[PDB]
Tab-separated table of C-alpha atoms in Angstrom:
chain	number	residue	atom	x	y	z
A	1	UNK	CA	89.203	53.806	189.345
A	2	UNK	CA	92.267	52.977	191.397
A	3	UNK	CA	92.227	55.196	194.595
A	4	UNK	CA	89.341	57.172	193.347
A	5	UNK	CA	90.220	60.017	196.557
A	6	UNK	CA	93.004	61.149	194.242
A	7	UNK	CA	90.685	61.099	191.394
A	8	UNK	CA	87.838	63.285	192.849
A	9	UNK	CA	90.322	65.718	194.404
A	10	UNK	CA	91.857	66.525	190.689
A	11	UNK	CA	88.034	67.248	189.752
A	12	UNK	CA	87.976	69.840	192.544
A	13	UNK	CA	91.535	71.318	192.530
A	14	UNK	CA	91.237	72.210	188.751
A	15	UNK	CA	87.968	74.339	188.498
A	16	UNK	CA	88.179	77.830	188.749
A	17	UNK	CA	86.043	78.121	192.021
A	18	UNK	CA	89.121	76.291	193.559
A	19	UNK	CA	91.030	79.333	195.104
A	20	UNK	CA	94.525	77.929	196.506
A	21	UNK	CA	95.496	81.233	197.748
A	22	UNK	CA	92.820	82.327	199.853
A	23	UNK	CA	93.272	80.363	203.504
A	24	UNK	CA	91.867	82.698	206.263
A	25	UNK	CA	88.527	84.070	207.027
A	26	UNK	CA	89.022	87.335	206.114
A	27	UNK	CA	90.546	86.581	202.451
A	28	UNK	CA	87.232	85.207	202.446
A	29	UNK	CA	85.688	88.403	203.252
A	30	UNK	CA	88.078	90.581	200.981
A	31	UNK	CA	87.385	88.671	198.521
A	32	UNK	CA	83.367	88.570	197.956
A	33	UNK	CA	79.858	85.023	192.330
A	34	UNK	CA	77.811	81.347	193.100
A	35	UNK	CA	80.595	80.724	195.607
A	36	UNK	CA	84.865	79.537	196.208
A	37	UNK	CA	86.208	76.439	196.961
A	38	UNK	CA	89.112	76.191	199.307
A	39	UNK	CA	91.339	74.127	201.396
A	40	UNK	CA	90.227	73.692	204.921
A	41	UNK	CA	92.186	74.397	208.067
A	42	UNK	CA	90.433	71.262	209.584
A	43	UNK	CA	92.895	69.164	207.241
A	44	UNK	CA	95.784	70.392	209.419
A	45	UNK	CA	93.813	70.107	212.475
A	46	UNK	CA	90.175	60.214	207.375
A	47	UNK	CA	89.262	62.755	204.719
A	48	UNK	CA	90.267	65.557	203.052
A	49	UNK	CA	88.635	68.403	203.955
A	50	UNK	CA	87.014	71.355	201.610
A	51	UNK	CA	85.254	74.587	202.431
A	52	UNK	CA	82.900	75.651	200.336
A	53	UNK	CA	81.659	79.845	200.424
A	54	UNK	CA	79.263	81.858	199.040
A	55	UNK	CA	77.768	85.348	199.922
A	56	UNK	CA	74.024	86.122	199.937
A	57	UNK	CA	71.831	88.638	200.723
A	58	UNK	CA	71.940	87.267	204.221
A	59	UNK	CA	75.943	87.442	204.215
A	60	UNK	CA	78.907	85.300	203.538
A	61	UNK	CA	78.033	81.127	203.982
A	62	UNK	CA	80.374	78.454	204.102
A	63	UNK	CA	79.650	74.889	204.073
A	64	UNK	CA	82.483	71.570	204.729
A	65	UNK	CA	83.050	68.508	202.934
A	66	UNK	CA	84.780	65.778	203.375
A	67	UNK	CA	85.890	62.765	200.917
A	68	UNK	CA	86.842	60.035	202.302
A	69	UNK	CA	89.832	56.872	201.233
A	70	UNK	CA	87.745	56.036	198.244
A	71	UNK	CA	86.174	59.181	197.525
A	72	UNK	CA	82.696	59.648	198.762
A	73	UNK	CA	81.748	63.265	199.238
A	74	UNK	CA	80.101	64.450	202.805
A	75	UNK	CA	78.584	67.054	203.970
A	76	UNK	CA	79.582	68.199	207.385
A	77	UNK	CA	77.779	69.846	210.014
A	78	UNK	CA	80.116	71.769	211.911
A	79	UNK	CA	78.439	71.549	214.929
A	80	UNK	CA	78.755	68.089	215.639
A	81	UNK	CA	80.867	66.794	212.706
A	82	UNK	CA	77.705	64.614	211.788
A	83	UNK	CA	78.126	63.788	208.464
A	84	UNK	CA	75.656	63.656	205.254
A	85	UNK	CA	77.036	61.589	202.333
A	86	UNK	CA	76.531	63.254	198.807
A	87	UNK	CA	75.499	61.278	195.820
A	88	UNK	CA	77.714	62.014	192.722
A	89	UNK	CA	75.270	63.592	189.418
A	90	UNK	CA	76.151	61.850	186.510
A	91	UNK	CA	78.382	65.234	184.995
A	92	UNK	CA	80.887	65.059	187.905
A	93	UNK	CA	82.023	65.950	191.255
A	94	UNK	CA	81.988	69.261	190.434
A	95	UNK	CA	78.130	69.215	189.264
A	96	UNK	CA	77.748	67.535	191.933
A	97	UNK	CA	79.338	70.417	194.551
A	98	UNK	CA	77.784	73.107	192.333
A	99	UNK	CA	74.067	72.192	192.793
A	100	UNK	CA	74.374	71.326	196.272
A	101	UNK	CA	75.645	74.853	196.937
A	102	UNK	CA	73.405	76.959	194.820
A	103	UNK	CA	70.356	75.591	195.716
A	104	UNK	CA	71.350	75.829	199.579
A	105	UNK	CA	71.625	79.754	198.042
A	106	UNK	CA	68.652	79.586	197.430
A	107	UNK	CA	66.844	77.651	200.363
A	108	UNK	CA	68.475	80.769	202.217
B	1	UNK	CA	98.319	64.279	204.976
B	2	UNK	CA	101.110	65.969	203.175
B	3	UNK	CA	100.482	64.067	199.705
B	4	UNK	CA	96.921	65.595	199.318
B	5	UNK	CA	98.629	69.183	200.060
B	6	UNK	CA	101.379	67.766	197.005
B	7	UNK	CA	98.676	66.941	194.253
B	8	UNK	CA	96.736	70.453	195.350
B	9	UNK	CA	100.050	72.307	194.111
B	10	UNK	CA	100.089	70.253	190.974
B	11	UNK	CA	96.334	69.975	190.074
B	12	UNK	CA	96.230	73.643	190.179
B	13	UNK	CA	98.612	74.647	188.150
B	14	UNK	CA	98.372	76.153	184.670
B	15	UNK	CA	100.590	73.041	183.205
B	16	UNK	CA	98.483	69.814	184.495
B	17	UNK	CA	96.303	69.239	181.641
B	18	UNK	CA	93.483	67.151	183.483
B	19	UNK	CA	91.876	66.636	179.752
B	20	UNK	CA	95.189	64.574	178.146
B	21	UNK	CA	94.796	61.170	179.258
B	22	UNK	CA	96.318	59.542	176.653
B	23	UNK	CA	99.841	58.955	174.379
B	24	UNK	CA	97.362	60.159	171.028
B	25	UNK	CA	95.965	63.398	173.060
B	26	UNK	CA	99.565	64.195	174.136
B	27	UNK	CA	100.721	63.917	170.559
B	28	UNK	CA	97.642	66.010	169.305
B	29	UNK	CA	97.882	68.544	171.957
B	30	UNK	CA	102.081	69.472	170.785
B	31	UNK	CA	100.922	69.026	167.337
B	32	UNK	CA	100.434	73.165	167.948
B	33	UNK	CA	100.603	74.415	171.176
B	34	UNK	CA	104.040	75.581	172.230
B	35	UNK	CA	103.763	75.213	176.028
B	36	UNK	CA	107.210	74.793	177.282
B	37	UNK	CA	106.085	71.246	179.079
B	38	UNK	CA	102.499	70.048	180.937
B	39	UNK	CA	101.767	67.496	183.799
B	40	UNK	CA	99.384	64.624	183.331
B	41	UNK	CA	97.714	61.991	185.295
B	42	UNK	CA	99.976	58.673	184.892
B	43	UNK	CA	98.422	55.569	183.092
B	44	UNK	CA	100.373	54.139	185.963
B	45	UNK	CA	99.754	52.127	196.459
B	46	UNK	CA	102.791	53.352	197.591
B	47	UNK	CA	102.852	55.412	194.390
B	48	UNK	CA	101.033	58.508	193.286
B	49	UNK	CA	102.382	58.598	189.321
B	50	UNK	CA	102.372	62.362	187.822
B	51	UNK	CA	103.336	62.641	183.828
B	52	UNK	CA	105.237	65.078	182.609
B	53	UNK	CA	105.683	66.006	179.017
B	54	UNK	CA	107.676	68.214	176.832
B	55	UNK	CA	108.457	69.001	173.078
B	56	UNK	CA	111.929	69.325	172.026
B	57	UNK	CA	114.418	69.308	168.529
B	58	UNK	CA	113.974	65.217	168.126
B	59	UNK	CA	110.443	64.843	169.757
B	60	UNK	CA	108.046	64.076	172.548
B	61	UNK	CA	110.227	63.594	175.790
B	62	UNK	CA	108.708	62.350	179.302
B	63	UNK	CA	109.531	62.156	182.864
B	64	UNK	CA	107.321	60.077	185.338
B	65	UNK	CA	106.930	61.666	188.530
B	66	UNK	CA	105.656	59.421	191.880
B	67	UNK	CA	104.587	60.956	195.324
B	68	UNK	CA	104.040	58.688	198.020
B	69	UNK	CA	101.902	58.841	201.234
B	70	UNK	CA	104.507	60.914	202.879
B	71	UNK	CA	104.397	63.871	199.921
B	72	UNK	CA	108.099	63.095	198.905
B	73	UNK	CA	108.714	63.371	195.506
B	74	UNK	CA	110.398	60.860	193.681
B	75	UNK	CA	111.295	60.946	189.273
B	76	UNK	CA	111.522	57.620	188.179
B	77	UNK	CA	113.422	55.429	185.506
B	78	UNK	CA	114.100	53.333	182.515
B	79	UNK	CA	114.912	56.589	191.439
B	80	UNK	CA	116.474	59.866	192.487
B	81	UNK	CA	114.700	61.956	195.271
B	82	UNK	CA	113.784	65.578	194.493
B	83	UNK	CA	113.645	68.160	197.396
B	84	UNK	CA	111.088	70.742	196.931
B	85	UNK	CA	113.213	74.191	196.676
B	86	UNK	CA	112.163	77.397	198.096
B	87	UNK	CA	109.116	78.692	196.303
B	88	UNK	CA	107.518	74.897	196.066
B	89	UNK	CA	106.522	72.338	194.340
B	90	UNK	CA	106.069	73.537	190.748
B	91	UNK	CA	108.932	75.905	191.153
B	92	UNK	CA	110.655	72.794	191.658
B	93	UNK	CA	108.971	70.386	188.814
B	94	UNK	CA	109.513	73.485	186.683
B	95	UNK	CA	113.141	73.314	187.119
B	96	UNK	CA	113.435	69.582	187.025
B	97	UNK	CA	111.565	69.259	183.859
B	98	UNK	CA	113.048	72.484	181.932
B	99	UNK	CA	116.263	71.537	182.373
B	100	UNK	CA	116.401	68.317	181.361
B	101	UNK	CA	114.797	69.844	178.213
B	102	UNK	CA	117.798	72.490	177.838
B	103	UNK	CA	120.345	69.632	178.770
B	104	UNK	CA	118.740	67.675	175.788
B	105	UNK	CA	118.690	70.820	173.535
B	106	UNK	CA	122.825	70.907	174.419
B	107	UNK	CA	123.307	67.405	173.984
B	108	UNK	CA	121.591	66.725	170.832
């Protein structure tokens, strides 16, 4: 386990819906798919920070989470910056990201 | 922190292999591919350890790679600090690694 932050972030930075090169709202836009995964701008401005988008019928959604030292995912309301830990599903951090994201999809 | 923004260069590039975590799966893995080298998560606080490997004329050659807290990267031994280049990180390991391959391929 070690430092599991570094651990969790490897699970995130090597699946596809990882997109290093898109890092403005607009390259967002341009580019929508269940959704992207990206760096946040929040990390520049505790954890590490990752945006999460998708578009729906409704439009383009994003939704932040945070990992923290020892790599617990959050869920981040953006609003207040009160946070919603994640439990991990037994196939991973990305299963984990991947339902929480889809079924939001759907809720909308 | 700059470290996280380190292993997101690395973790996404076409030569980490996030599915080689051992000596045997590095040994099976050049048993066919040709890939010039990959990058690896170290078996290995202050010290992030990245893996590199590479196949040349006498064998299977690695170079252990740290990163700190600070996102300084450091090769180690048996130290020597490595400045990331224009064009970053992997432009740099890239360099680092290769040509210690092609100084190998001279010297033996």
């Amino acid at each position: 386990e070690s430092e599991k932050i570094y651990k969790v972030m490897e699970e995130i930075f090597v699946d596809r819906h990882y997109k290093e090169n898109i890092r403005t709202g607009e390259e967002v836009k341009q580019y929508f798919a269940e959704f992207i995964l990206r760096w946040s701008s929040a990390n520049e401005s505790k954890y590490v920070f990752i945006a999460a988008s998708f578009q729906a019928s409704d439009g383009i959604h994003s939704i932040r989470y945070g990992i923290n030292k020892n790599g617990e995912l959050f869920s981040i309301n953006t609003a207040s910056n009160k946070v919603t830990p994640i439990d991990i599903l037994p196939l991973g951090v990305m299963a984990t990201l991947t339902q929480h994201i889809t079924q939001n999809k759907e809720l909308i």
